[PDB]
Amino acid sequence: IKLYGREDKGTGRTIKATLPYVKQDIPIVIVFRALGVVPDGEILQHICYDENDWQMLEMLKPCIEEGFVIQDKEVALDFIGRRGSAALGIRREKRIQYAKDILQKELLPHITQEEGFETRKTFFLGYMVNRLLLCALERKDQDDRDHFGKKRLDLAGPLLANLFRILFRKLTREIYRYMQRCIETDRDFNLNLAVK
Amino acid sequence: QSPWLLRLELDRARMLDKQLTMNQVADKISEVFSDDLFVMWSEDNADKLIIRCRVIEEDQMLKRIEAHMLDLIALRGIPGISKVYMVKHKVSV
Amino acid sequence: DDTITTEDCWTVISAFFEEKGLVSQQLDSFDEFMETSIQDLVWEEPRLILDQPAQHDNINKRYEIRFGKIYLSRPTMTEADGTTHAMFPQEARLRNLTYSSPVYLDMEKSMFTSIDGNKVHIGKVPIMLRSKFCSLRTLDEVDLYKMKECPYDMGGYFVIN
Amino acid sequence: DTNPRSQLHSVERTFDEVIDPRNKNRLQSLIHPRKKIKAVKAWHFFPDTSTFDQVFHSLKFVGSASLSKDRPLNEQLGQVNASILTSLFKPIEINPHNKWISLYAVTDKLSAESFRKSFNSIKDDNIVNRHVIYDHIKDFDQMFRGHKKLFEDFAISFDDISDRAFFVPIVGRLELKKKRIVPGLVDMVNRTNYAHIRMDLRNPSTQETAIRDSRREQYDPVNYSSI
Amino acid sequence: IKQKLETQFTCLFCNHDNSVVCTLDKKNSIGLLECKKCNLSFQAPINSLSQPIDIYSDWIDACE
Amino acid sequence: GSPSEPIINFLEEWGMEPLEDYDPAQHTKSTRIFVNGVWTGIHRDPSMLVSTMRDLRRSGAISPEVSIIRDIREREFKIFTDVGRVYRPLFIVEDDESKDNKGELRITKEHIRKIQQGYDDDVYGWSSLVTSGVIEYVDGEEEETIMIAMTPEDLQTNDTAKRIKPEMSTSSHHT
Amino acid sequence: SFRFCLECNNMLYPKEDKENQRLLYSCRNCDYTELAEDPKVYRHELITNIGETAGIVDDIGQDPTLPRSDKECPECHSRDCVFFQSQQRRKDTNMTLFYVCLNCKKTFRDE
Amino acid sequence: HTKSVYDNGETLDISLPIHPKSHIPQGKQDRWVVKLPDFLDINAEPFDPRPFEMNVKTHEDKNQELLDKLIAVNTVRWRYAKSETGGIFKETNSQIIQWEDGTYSLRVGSEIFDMFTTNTDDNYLVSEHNEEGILMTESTLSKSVKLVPASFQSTTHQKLAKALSAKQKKESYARSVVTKEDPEERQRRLESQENERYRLERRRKQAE
Amino acid sequence: TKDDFSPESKGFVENSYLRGLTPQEFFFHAMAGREGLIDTAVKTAETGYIQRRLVK
Numbered sequence A: 001i002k003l004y005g006r007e008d009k010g011t012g013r014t015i016k017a018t019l020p021y022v023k024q025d026i027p028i029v030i031v032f033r034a035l036g037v038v039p040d041g042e043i044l045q046h047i048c049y050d051e052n053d054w055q056m057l058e059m060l061k062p063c064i065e066e067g068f069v070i071q072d073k074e075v076a077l078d079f080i081g082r083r084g085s086a087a088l089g090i091r092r093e094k095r096i097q098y099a100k101d102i103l104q105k106e107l108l109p110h111i112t113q114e115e116g117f118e119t120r121k122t123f124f125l126g127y128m129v130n131r132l133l134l135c136a137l138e139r140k141d142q143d144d145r146d147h148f149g150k151k152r153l154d155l156a157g158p159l160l161a162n163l164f165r166i167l168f169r170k171l172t173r174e175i176y177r178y179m180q181r182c183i184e185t186d187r188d189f190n191l192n193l194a195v196k
Numbered sequence B: 001q002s003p004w005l006l007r008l009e010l011d012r013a014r015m016l017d018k019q020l021t022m023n024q025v026a027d028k029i030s031e032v033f034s035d036d037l038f039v040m041w042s043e044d045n046a047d048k049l050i051i052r053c054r055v056i057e058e059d060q061m062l063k064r065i066e067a068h069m070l071d072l073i074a075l076r077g078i079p080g081i082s083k084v085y086m087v088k089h090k091v092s093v
Numbered sequence C: 001d002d003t004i005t006t007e008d009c010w011t012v013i014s015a016f017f018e019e020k021g022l023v024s025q026q027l028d029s030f031d032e033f034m035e036t037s038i039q040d041l042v043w044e045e046p047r048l049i050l051d052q053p054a055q056h057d058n059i060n061k062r063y064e065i066r067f068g069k070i071y072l073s074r075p076t077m078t079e080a081d082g083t084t085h086a087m088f089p090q091e092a093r094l095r096n097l098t099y100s101s102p103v104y105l106d107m108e109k110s111m112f113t114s115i116d117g118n119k120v121h122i123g124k125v126p127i128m129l130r131s132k133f134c135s136l137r138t139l140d141e142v143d144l145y146k147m148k149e150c151p152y153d154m155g156g157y158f159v160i161n
Numbered sequence D: 001d002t003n004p005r006s007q008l009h010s011v012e013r014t015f016d017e018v019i020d021p022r023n024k025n026r027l028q029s030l031i032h033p034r035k036k037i038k039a040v041k042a043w044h045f046f047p048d049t050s051t052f053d054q055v056f057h058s059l060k061f062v063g064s065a066s067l068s069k070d071r072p073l074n075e076q077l078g079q080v081n082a083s084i085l086t087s088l089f090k091p092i093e094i095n096p097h098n099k100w101i102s103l104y105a106v107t108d109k110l111s112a113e114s115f116r117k118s119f120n121s122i123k124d125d126n127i128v129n130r131h132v133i134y135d136h137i138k139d140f141d142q143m144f145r146g147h148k149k150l151f152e153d154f155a156i157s158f159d160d161i162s163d164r165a166f167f168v169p170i171v172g173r174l175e176l177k178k179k180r181i182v183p184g185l186v187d188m189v190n191r192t193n194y195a196h197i198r199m200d201l202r203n204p205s206t207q208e209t210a211i212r213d214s215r216r217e218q219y220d221p222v223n224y225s226s227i
Numbered sequence E: 001i002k003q004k005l006e007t008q009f010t011c012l013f014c015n016h017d018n019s020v021v022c023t024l025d026k027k028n029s030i031g032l033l034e035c036k037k038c039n040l041s042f043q044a045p046i047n048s049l050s051q052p053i054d055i056y057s058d059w060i061d062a063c064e
Numbered sequence F: 001g002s003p004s005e006p007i008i009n010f011l012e013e014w015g016m017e018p019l020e021d022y023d024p025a026q027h028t029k030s031t032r033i034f035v036n037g038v039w040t041g042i043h044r045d046p047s048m049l050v051s052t053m054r055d056l057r058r059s060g061a062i063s064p065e066v067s068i069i070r071d072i073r074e075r076e077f078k079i080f081t082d083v084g085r086v087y088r089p090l091f092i093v094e095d096d097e098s099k100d101n102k103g104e105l106r107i108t109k110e111h112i113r114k115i116q117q118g119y120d121d122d123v124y125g126w127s128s129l130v131t132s133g134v135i136e137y138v139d140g141e142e143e144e145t146i147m148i149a150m151t152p153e154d155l156q157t158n159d160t161a162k163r164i165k166p167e168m169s170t171s172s173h174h175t
Numbered sequence G: 001s002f003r004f005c006l007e008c009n010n011m012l013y014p015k016e017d018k019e020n021q022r023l024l025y026s027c028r029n030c031d032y033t034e035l036a037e038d039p040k041v042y043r044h045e046l047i048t049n050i051g052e053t054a055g056i057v058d059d060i061g062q063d064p065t066l067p068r069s070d071k072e073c074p075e076c077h078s079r080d081c082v083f084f085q086s087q088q089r090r091k092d093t094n095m096t097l098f099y100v101c102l103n104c105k106k107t108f109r110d111e
Numbered sequence H: 001h002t003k004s005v006y007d008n009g010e011t012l013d014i015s016l017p018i019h020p021k022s023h024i025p026q027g028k029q030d031r032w033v034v035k036l037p038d039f040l041d042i043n044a045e046p047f048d049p050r051p052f053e054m055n056v057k058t059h060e061d062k063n064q065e066l067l068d069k070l071i072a073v074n075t076v077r078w079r080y081a082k083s084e085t086g087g088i089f090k091e092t093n094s095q096i097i098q099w100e101d102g103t104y105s106l107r108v109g110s111e112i113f114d115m116f117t118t119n120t121d122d123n124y125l126v127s128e129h130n131e132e133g134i135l136m137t138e139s140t141l142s143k144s145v146k147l148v149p150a151s152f153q154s155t156t157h158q159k160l161a162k163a164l165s166a167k168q169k170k171e172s173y174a175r176s177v178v179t180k181e182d183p184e185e186r187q188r189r190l191e192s193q194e195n196e197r198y199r200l201e202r203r204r205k206q207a208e
Numbered sequence I: 001t002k003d004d005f006s007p008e009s010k011g012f013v014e015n016s017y018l019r020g021l022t023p024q025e026f027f028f029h030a031m032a033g034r035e036g037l038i039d040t041a042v043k044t045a046e047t048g049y050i051q052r053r054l055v056k
């Protein structure tokens, strides 16, 4: 979630969000509406948690002004679907379905994977934007990259698990290719020959 | 003219520290802006030092004018010289 | 009660090293891997599917295979003459062998049709020494000496070639 | 305690140790394990017989759909209001993709009060024909979440005179958000809902009453089984 | 200011590829797609955030 | 690595309210609850919750390598069961004000004698110490919220050859 | 502070009537218009002190890593308190202390 | 001034059948929604001791059996109690206890679970009429109530802690086996059989 | 404790090598030594490149 615009430069300080399988960045208001919360007041309710802080509201104002052009969920999803790096010429309904797929899955997968569970995704998006604003308004120091409680160590277990995942996927693809070749001959394969 | 008003509150302590006069700032604004903006300024004795302005949908235009004014109004000094220090030099004569 | 001296702290540290040892993280990670991770990786994508809408009387045929349980064994050595025997790390070190064990997977095949399977060997996984799946885990001090293994050796490594 | 006899004995032990709410001395005998605070009042926990046949859903408004936030709507419907407590909801679905809920209420305070009083006093077999007219107010977008278990949620109502507490099952939760109607679809919108709906109060038919009693027979068979 | 860009879109009348040019004028909020072979012209309104993909999708929706 | 499902069950049992029932205007003082980096709910009495979670972990109900972190300043309560976290053990000081043993180590000479014998007086090793609540593991992230004495002599308040210890006079008292 | 629309929850932008000479907050997504109470359309603080004492929580007395003093409370005159420096972390920030009592839990200075 | 969209005036003459209620709220149409914890279950059915005894299930997994035992002994139940005067009365094993501070607690047997109430706005209870496809409101859900165990020493909390601690201790998916021959024997023997049948099929096709 | 600006809290070693360091002083001294080693092993390549360009 990038925060474009330098201090006293670049006019408005818009907040654009990078999304997977999307060729160009997207303002936070449009994706927020795409998730299914249109009113701007509720977007501010999700993002901010204390109404008296006028500075963060002022910093969110350019994003609201930029996103005012979009006002409906479906047009927001369509706008997501045009830039989704898919094959050119896809129809509008299929574009909207592709946007729904790329929004439900692959957008914060660690939260959830099922349909109609995007409320938690909206709350987490508000949390991320709140953290970005808190750091941008000099209220907190930037995160320590070298902090050791934010690091993890991979022992023999995880390394061998990643290696075995790659090798097993290769073996499964080989089994698939051999099965496709064998179905041409139409024989009751022993299945002890496909496995290498 | 327009109903929109633009007044800015300036810190008295740092304005006196830089040894500046309100009339000087008013003349600088008048020179850079000709008669496009009407300007008034509170006197020295005021409790809070203020200087207003009035233009002669224009809220965003006034916002851009205020941002431009804050950005590039040079009161005095050589541009590029951010800070100046006084130093004592031991010289053999 | 009574106060706790520095000697009590060293007693507690001795208890720690008596329970854990110095290479416990390696062995615990490898044991977790062998015990659960292989099965979970196999069950990540448990279904290969092939379909064929044959028209040559429309018969929509789906061919699919399921992956079942993972079976592991103790490491074994297969000779050129065809015989097999249990392998130990000293022999693998001396003869430049790999200390590894076979892995077996249950594949179940079904033949779906609409008109409108035993243990397969999938490979050999190298075994970490002194882990739960190593032959030296059980051996006591005397048989460890008979197997030409040093009792001060701690394990936590693999023997490849 | 894996013995079924032991489990049964524990069940009867729990059943027998119920404290009489009228017994003030035994109520004061009971002490909070952590707070160490004596008990004041007690209520029996019982299920509801007359409501198990019906289907109950917990309905909530999400975000700006709050009635308190909508000040002109709240002022029009009254600043608890009987109009809110007697409102009607009409789910209409043109297609699977497009769906909304229609809300109706009684603008008049006297008619709503009379209807609420008549509805809350149904204990006899005489119901007056209250031809109450409901006026449409607003429409909202809806989503539904289903409960895997039957009694996942339950609402508790109290009864001070009998010292009881009646609970009802909750089938699912309905969430509503404000919906802005597209200007290009107002022509089809005008042909879906209605400006007024008239509600007539009539005595239930014998066959429907028998069906509801048969549905209630699952819970209470002593007083409702057909003979 | 009119902006003329060469696009790799496919015309649905002539079927020739890489013969689609997008001309958008942000001042008048309009966007013109012209086929270098068919000489057909498609007009659709554009917004401040418009991109040639927007006009291309609008043309696809208009065609069907 | 440990499963997070029992953690969520314990949290939901002790009064945690999900996100769908959360209003930021109403909850201007509630604590956000994270589990493995996932915001799962909120709570309004974080002190009782963190006390209950820590007591459960010290008793062996929750795995000892689970992280329990309370950020009072940011109003957050984070829990980690992830794999790859580096931890170390420490003695536990009885911090309960209502207890008589306040400010003193939980481990006594009885524990040391049991460790030396090797069994309890109706195997007694390191794990017995860990699940008895006298020792616990902390990782680098949980270390930011605790106060550690360097030596057991530091728990109670002019030679030219002996090294000099810090005064630590900035605080009137230390807990 | 800015108000929101009471009917469609969008932002209420200020608007000026040429004929009536009044400041009105109007929603651009509808025809709703409400009369403004104050003429303060916008305010920008070049040098600000907000967030210096705003970072305060009601449970800060349960933190064991905070130092404890014996400064006198102005309200209830307690003998125990917990102090800390400014929560704002800019380069110009002062090193003054904020004290929190363990009974009334208010933030007070030493000057 | 947002003009009213609907002005046709069309009206439906729909009449709803309503049944008398066994109870009526007094003074306030308020109800409290309570989330059901895992350790608590609701048994609306009347308690029948003989089927209850005959349907006790025993499993090898100690944790599952302990969880079933805890939820069964903690299940809210009711049964018919024969009065000494010859009448029949409804008897329950669950009660609600209010302390001096005003808080409420749900009591089943000797177990006591505290209630935490959170005020909720614009939350109501409705009754669904599927045969007519409309929803009829019932009352207002002012407060949401969560059930919390009273203390550590409560048997329910200890059983839950024991079950959840021992549930994650059992973890063993891979099953050991003994290899008596070279694993690749199946592969080579099936390659030999396939080559033999390929040669036979090729000879038959050349002879066909 | 939090917000401690005393000399011992921020890396002042008041003992000598003969007297012996405390664990906090030991860790701070190790941090400083690590700084020294990194600085040498990082500036060597820049110095070598400058010397080569000067010679050429």
Ligand SMILES: [Zn+2]
Binding pocket: E011, E012, E013, E014, E015, E016, E035, E036, E037, E038, E039
């Ligand atoms: Zn063409």
Ligand SMILES: [Zn+2]
Binding pocket: G005, G006, G007, G008, G009, G010, G027, G028, G029, G030, G031, G032
């Ligand atoms: Zn509006």
Ligand SMILES: [Zn+2]
Binding pocket: G073, G074, G075, G076, G077, G078, G101, G102, G103, G104, G105, G106
């Ligand atoms: Zn005080």
